[PDB]
């Protein structure tokens, strides 16, 4: 009784951009994970720390589900100790974290003729992100000996750039929806728990 909302996160309609990943809290639930890894739609179901089949027996304090959309060739960056745009200037996972990473293709929903310019990603940043950070600032990236004063120009660029998702992009340049479940335990009781 009182199951967990794994339908408003996975089977939703519109996901967010990886520079504005959507976080959701889950507590006081009976979360049933077996329904997840008992499927073929999930092309990627990695799990760090915990084991997949041993998930309906633990009891964590709370769970954090981070949903977003990325390319197909950028999924290898969703993991501890990686490097690139996604991991550095966008969603960054800590080192030796406990949780699971799920990812599956969405070339049906997130593909448009002429390009879906609604999905964006941060390309420039003067430094790297700390783990679990969110920088939505659309400020101007300065790369020269000339201030930008909030005006795009020479060597002063815009950090957020669009994915050009089309339905003909073959495999690696196709949209992939990603959900990251972080199982955060604390010294407080274990509200979440598996079925019985």
């Amino acid at each position, epitope marked *: 009784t009182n199951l967990c909302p794994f339908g408003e996160v996975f089977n939703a309609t519109r996901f967010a951009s990886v520079y504005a990943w959507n976080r959701k809290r889950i507590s006081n639930c009976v979360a049933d994970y077996s329904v997840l890894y008992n499927s073929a739609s999930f092309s990627t179901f990695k799990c760090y720390g915990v084991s997949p089949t041993k998930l309906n027996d633990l009891c964590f304090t709370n769970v954090y589900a981070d949903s977003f959309v990325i390319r197909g060739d950028e999924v290898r960056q969703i993991a501890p100790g990686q490097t690139g745009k996604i991991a*550095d200037y966008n969603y960054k996972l800590p080192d030796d974290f406990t949780g699971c990473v799920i990812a599956w293709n969405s070339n049906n929903l997130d593909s448009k003729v002429g390009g879906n310019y609604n999905y964006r990603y941060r390309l420039f940043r003067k430094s790297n992100l700390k783990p679990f950070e969110r920088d939505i600032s659309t400020e101007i990236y300065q790369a020269g000996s000339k201030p930008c004063n909030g005006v795009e120009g020479f060597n002063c*660029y815009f950090p957020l750039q669009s994915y050009g998702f*089309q339905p003909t992009n073959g495999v690696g340049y196709q949209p992939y929806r990603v959900v990251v479940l972080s199982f955060e335990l604390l010294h407080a009781p274990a509200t979440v728990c598996g079925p019985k």
Partner: antibody
Amino acid sequence: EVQLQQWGAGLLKPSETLSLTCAVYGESFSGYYWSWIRQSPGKGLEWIGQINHSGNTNYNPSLKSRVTMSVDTSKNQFSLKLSSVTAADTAVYYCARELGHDYWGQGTLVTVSS
Amino acid sequence: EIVMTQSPGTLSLSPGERATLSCRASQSISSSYLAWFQQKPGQAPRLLIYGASSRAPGIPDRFSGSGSGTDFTLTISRLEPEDFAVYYCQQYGDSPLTFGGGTKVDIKR
């Protein structure tokens, strides 16, 4: 204006390591990303990586395994180390500022031969 | 990696003529983020055109750019002896960067 001075080893041998250093004179060394670029006849202009004033590195997936970088803010220098070199890594190496649109080095010709 | 391809691979012109080089990308590119670099013997590259349409400082008004998506075009109205060199196309809209192969511009006779 900015000036960039290159140095490093030229001739080398396979299985060895190629080290290069670029020094900056003319402006601030913090706030920008300093990049390394490569030019070989056949592969054209290639990009290797870029480093910050705090050790933050962006590499190229084709060389993420072999490429290593270093930065010294005291003398305002950055440096590249490329491991397990061959006769394919024979090329002209440039040091540039982020998105070299503004300023480049002069060129260090690195050759590899047993 | 966004592979770029320059067309043609070589040219042959004469002072006073007009030149046109093309860069075709494997996949559509960000807003207009494509640059054109000049490189001569020995020296290091130099930037002329950014955004595929803008003309950087210190660049004569004869260099022009245009295009979008997977087709960009650089044009030189009135050539000059200083303009016979190698030209590259660059994309700074997706990581990592990506240069072309080059398009030499040789004198004719």
